[PDB]
Amino acid sequence: SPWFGMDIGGTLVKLSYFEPIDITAEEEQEEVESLKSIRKYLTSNVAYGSTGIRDVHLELKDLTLFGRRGNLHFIRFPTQDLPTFIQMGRDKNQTVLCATGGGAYKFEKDFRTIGNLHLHKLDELDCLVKGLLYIDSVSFNGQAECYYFANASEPERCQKMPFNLDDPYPLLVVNIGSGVSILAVHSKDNYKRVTGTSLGGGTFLGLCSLLTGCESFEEALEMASKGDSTQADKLVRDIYGGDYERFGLPGWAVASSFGNMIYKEKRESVSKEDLARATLVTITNNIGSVARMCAVNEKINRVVFVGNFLRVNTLSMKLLAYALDYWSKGQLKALFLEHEGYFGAVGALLGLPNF
Amino acid sequence: SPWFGMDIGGTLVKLSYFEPIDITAEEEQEEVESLKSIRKYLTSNVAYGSTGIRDVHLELKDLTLFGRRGNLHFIRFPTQDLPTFIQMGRDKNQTVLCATGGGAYKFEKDFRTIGNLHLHKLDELDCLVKGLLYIDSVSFNGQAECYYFANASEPERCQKMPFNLDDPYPLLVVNIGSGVSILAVHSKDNYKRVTGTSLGGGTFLGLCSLLTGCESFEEALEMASKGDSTQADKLVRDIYGGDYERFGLPGWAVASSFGNMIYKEKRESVSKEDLARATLVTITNNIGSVARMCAVNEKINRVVFVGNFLRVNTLSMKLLAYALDYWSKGQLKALFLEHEGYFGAVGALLGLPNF
Ligand SMILES: Nc1ncnc2c1ncn2[C@@H]1O[C@H](COP(=O)(O)OP(N)(=O)O)[C@@H](O)[C@H]1O
Ligand SMILES: Nc1ncnc2c1ncn2[C@@H]1O[C@H](COP(=O)(O)OP(N)(=O)O)[C@@H](O)[C@H]1O
Ligand SMILES: [Mg+2]
Ligand SMILES: [Mg+2]
Numbered sequence: 001s002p003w004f005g006m007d008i009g010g011t012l013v014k015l016s017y018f019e020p021i022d023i024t025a026e027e028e029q030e031e032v033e034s035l036k037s038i039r040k041y042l043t044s045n046v047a048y049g050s051t052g053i054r055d056v057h058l059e060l061k062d063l064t065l066f067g068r069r070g071n072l073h074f075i076r077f078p079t080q081d082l083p084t085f086i087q088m089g090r091d092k093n094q095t096v097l098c099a100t101g102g103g104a105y106k107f108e109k110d111f112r113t114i115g116n117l118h119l120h121k122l123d124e125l126d127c128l129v130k131g132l133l134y135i136d137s138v139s140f141n142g143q144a145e146c147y148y149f150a151n152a153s154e155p156e157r158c159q160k161m162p163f164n165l166d167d168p169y170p171l172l173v174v175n176i177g178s179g180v181s182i183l184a185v186h187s188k189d190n191y192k193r194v195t196g197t198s199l200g201g202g203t204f205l206g207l208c209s210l211l212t213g214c215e216s217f218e219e220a221l222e223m224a225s226k227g228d229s230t231q232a233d234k235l236v237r238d239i240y241g242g243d244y245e246r247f248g249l250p251g252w253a254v255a256s257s258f259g260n261m262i263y264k265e266k267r268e269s270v271s272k273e274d275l276a277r278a279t280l281v282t283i284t285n286n287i288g289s290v291a292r293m294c295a296v297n298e299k300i301n302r303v304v305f306v307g308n309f310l311r312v313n314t315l316s317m318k319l320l321a322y323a324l325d326y327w328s329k330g331q332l333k334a335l336f337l338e339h340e341g342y343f344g345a346v347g348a349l350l351g352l353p354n355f
Numbered sequence: 356s357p358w359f360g361m362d363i364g365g366t367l368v369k370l371s372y373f374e375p376i377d378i379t380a381e382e383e384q385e386e387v388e389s390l391k392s393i394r395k396y397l398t399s400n401v402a403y404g405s406t407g408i409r410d411v412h413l414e415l416k417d418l419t420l421f422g423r424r425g426n427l428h429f430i431r432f433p434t435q436d437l438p439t440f441i442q443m444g445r446d447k448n449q450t451v452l453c454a455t456g457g458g459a460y461k462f463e464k465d466f467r468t469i470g471n472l473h474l475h476k477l478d479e480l481d482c483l484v485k486g487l488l489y490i491d492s493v494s495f496n497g498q499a500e501c502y503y504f505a506n507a508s509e510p511e512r513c514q515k516m517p518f519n520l521d522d523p524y525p526l527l528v529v530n531i532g533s534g535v536s537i538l539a540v541h542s543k544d545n546y547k548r549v550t551g552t553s554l555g556g557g558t559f560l561g562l563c564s565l566l567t568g569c570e571s572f573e574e575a576l577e578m579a580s581k582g583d584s585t586q587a588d589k590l591v592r593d594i595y596g597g598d599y600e601r602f603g604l605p606g607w608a609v610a611s612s613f614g615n616m617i618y619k620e621k622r623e624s625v626s627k628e629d630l631a632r633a634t635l636v637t638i639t640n641n642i643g644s645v646a647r648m649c650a651v652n653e654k655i656n657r658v659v660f661v662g663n664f665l666r667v668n669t670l671s672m673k674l675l676a677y678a679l680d681y682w683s684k685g686q687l688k689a690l691f692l693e694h695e696g697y698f699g700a701v702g703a704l705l706g707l708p709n710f
Contacts, residue, residue, distance in 0.1 A: 010593065010610060010611060102594035102595040103594070105596050105597070107596075178594070178610060179609075179612075193602050198611055198612045198641075202613070203612045203613050206613035206617045207613050209617060210622060234365055238365065239533070241457075246480075257561075258557070259366075264570070282553070285553065286554055289550070290644070293648040293652065
């Protein structure tokens with residue numbers, strides 16, 4: 001029985017797979033053919049069908065898990081294609097599946113069409129927290145799992161630096177997926193969802209597709225990297241003529257996101273790339289501001305950002321780092337994690353012994 | 356010299372004009388002709404040029420101000436047209452002008468092209484607070500200036516009801532204009548800007564114009580009233596298949612604003628009206644959520660919403676009322692004010708004796 005953990009989100013399915021590398025002589029001796037087939041297929045491909053991807057660089061090697069040593073693999077595909085995944089699961093076969101995320105409930109009955117499968121639904125919260133704390137504890141192959149942007153306010157000196165979470169409490173976790181969930185973690189056994197916002201990664205992707213006609217997350221980011229958001233946004237200096245000193249709002253700060261788009265002549269001259277960047281900047285800064293308010297409310301100074309809105313998205317990471325540092329005068333630290341999209345899937349996998 | 360107060364914002368100029376009604380026999384006797392001309396023009400028209408509007412229903416009658424009795428009028432026009440206002444001000448003429456808002460600084464030199472004019476810039480904060488507290492103190496011609504939506508969670512019983520602010524401290528003021536400013540008022544002499552968000556009225560209007568091609572705020576609201584935002588938004592039940600019980604998120608709550616627009620087939624079937632409503636709902640709920648976080652942070656349970664994003668916008672008012680009541684289990688009260696766009700202009704006017 002292959003050991004999987006699965007996080008079925010609104011947009012992406014994330015899968016963690018533990019591959020045994022201590023398979024002795026007898027264990028292999030007629031491992032069921034389909035079991036060998038699965039392992040070979042999963043380890044010999046980096047793309048699965050048309051939409052499946054193994055994030056090879058994230059792989060954890062020579063991990064000891066449940067008394068076996070092995071490699072932990074990370075795989076993702078769109079939730080839209082889960083029916084294909086399930087259909088191919090009814091092709092050749094015994095497996096226990098730990099699943100979390102909203103789709104663990106929505107697609108419960110579908111997974112049960114696989115005859116040789118028991119589905120154990122696990123709570124999203126327990127999985128995220130257990131997964132995050134586990135990965136940081138085993139490290140990223142000896143390297144830090146957690147990092148921050150040192151001197152996030154000065155672009156000439158700003159750089160990614162490892163961050164130590166050996167005593168990770170308290171912690172604010174900001175999960176940016178389709179929507180945004182915010183958790184306060186006070187201990188391994190004590191955490192609560194603080195709030196959320198519906199303005200998250202799917203807002204960025206949805207709006208960006210409406211405004212620019214982009215057809216992928218990566219294309220949207222590529223467009224944004226070429227844009228100038230100030231063409232769409234109304235800035236403090238557009239309103240004051242300069243800075244607002246009395247409240248320390250610099251002239252370059254955004255006063256009204258997309259606020260220049262109320263003028264027809266500006267709508268007619270703005271580029272797609274400008275609109276992609278303004279969308280990214282708008283969604284990201286709003287999340288940063290909500291994150292700061294929760295942290296102040298919860299009296300927590302370490303804010304960790306996870307979820308896949310931030311994968312291959314350095315712009316948003318730097319925006320978040322700069323914003324928390326600026327507005328808090330250095331009291332708040334924006335923290336990031338190498339495996340940020342996969343913590344739910346790992347936590348699911350870790351719930352395996354309790355079944 | 357006519358008594359004006361002016362609030363020059365990023366989008367609208369708001370003007371409060373005090374018309375004396377106790378003009379005796381000698382006072383009129385050769386009041387300078389241009390002074391009579393101004394008064395006649397202002398009181399005999401409700402539309403001024405192409406873009407100026409007197410909000411006649413807001414007029415305060417038989418007010419005693421600065422020892423004179425008179426009527427307080429409320430007038431608005433787009434900031435875009437301020438050069439026209441100024442040009443016509445150089446036509447016929449002595450006047451002292453109290454002005455607040457960012458444009459008091461940006462257009463300082465322009466106002467000084469009017470030879471017989473001294474411009475006194477006043478701080479936006481002092482004006483808003485003084486203006487709000489003044490109007491509520493004199494009442495809306497005997498009626499409450501402040502109101503709330505009773506039973507905001509049940510549409511069959513939900514209705515506008517007067518609210519008493521005789522002891523208005525403490526107070527959270529959420530000013531929704533082009534952007535959003537949030538103030539905590541602890542006393543008449545003690546208040547601070549808590550935070551803000553750049554996702555405000557200009558975001559709604561700008562995005563709505565990009566997405567739907569609407570050419571006015573009113574048209575945008577009209578489109579939104581005919582729409583179904585759930586066509587653009589991804590809901591909790593789209594992700595879970597139903598409700599999320601563990602954290603009390605109902606199936607109908609929005610999980611990801613515009614989150615369904617990541618799918619090409621849904622982008623192709625959505626209407627303009629759906630997109631207008633989703634824009635309104637998205638911006639409004641985000642403001643409600645930010646408002647709730649500040650209030651919890653500031654330990655204030657009365658939240659007053661002002662600014663012109665809410666004029667002729669019952670939908671957004673009810674959304675705000677419902678959200679604060681729901682999420683706070685009745686601890687927080689969303690409050691609204693009849694003169695909500697004009698408090699800065701009134702506070703400016705009231706600074707007149709100090710010059
Ligand atoms: N390949 C990708 N496809 C779709 N969305 C992607 C993506 N890579 C990154 N993203 C972003 O990640 C977000 C989903 O993040 P995730 O953390 O997996 O959310 P969820 N709700 O599916 O569980 C999307 O909204 C998008 O902004
Ligand atoms: N006639 C109108 N024209 C333009 N915007 C209008 C409007 N009536 C209401 N609005 C809304 O009010 C917002 C401006 O509110 P206001 O409080 O006067 O902002 P500001 N920054 O100009 O001082 C606009 O963004 C729009 O959403
Ligand atoms: Mg998720
Ligand atoms: Mg204003």
